[PDB]
Symmetry: D2
């Protein structure tokens, strides 16, 4: 199944934050309405924040997370969770190798903000 | 029900990251085995990362998040999500006021690391 | 925080299914736009299905689950989870006593159907 | 990523329940330590509960859900969620066709019981 694709409410600010846990430099692309809206890159084996941004979900609310290591797409896993019918998390993990820890880049999207 | 309390695997490194979305200064305390292990403070209405740390779950694996705003405890909501049977997120939202957006401090715990 | 309250898409059919794990007879009320739309009641310590039904979320999409044991309201825990941006679960646990297993009535709401 | 595989606590009773939403007859297999422990089957476009059973997770705690429609394996999506650090749901959706509703067989595993 498709992973790393979320429908947010239209025209809504959201946070995106990426962490790294891999020997490889992670490249995280965040697409809004099928166009690149933010790109992060960094390397850490200690959960370093390689990127954090506030974006607008745009008129469609379509947000996609892609992860690559030296141009090779990582295998993604994802889910959305809503707490108390208000607080939204869109969560992505990614696997760049064979150990299947799925933490090589970790991306958290959260809304609403403010 | 109790919220903001999670049992991790023993002796396991985890990341904890806090975000703020409120007029009020958030204080986020992260306890391991009932002992303060990290404290973050800050004020943002735009999802600032008021802090991020790597901690060890220790012999009990017990991790608790507490949030307060000038010494008043915020109301918490929480859940844990596991992707592909391997990648763990422990999620907390908090409310300092009356609007019930539960984003006033947002805390994300993730493991495993590395 | 409020629990057992979910906003579904308007005018959308959903499944609601309850299970029991308690010495107490569980009463599960499902409200749609603040009106009782289904009531299940039953007793099991072995996860028996005490009721299943398909409802329509109506113009508001507001669905609420309440659980009581002989008119005593149970404490609830809840969350919504979305897989591959398509499949929705609204999950409720409930506690009627002192052991805090929160399984005394378990309610699963799922959509879309068909 | 692998989907429909969950590590439960060893030697623990759990509920497994399947729902159908498809023109195709669903077959759900539930494996415990890599051996078939339960098989459910039915055909519904209205969320019929085609099976529900209580199983034991056995010494490994490994539970796997597989879905097929006239011998063709369906594509799976899954996650586990934990509420109040106690109540566990392991969730599976499946796709037998081209519309990607992922509801064609829906499986819910819940523990603890009793
Ligand atoms: C792109 C990349 O560097 N992947 C492979 C490495 O595995 C990554 O980095 C390590 C440190 C872990 O974070 C992995 O989960 C991640 O996919 C790999 O590094 C080795 O991984 C071992 C477990 O897979 C173990 O941690 C070992 O200590 C570490 O060196 C290197 C070397 O095998 O190969 C890359 O292709
Ligand atoms: C600790 C504190 O200041 N809390 C209340 C204020 O609300 C907080 O800050 C605002 C900016 C939002 O992030 C709220 O979610 C958060 O709880 C509250 O401030 C007012 O909140 C309104 C919504 O309730 C709206 O954002 C408004 O613009 C903002 O000024 C003040 C006034 O009600 O009360 C505090 O309790
Ligand atoms: C409605 C009710 O009777 N609630 C409490 C009882 O506990 C319920 O039923 C038992 C079988 C468990 O499913 C509990 O999770 C559930 O809340 C409680 O019954 C006792 O619960 C013990 C564990 O707390 C244990 O299972 C024991 O066998 C059982 O008798 C009674 C008496 O403690 O109190 C009610 O409040
Ligand atoms: C196993 C099978 O028959 N799969 C496809 C059919 O779609 C399944 O059944 C329908 C009723 C829905 O529950 C689907 O989600 C499910 O995968 C499919 O039947 C047609 O599906 C349409 C949407 O793709 C629509 O629901 C229509 O009413 C129904 O006839 C058939 C024919 O397109 O193709 C199979 O692959
Ligand atoms: Ca890896
Ligand atoms: Ca890694
Ligand atoms: Ca607030
Ligand atoms: Ca706020
Ligand atoms: Ca109980
Ligand atoms: Ca019980
Ligand atoms: Ca389908
Ligand atoms: Ca279907």
């Amino acid at each position: 199944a498709t992973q790393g694709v979320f429908t947010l409410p239209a025209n809504t600010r959201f946070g995106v934050t990426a962490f790294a846990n891999s020997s490889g430099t992670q490249t995280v692309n965040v697409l809004v309405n099928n166009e690149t809206a933010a790109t992060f890159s960094g390397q850490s084996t200690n959960n370093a924040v390689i990127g954090t941004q506030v974006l607008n979900s745009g008129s469609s609310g379509k947000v996609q997370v892609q992860v690559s290591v030296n141009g090779r797409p990582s295998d993604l896993v994802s889910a959305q969770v809503i707490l108390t019918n208000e607080l939204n998390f869109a969560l992505v993990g990614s696997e760049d190798g064979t150990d299947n820890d799925y933490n090589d880049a970790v991306v958290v999207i959260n809304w609403p903000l403010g």
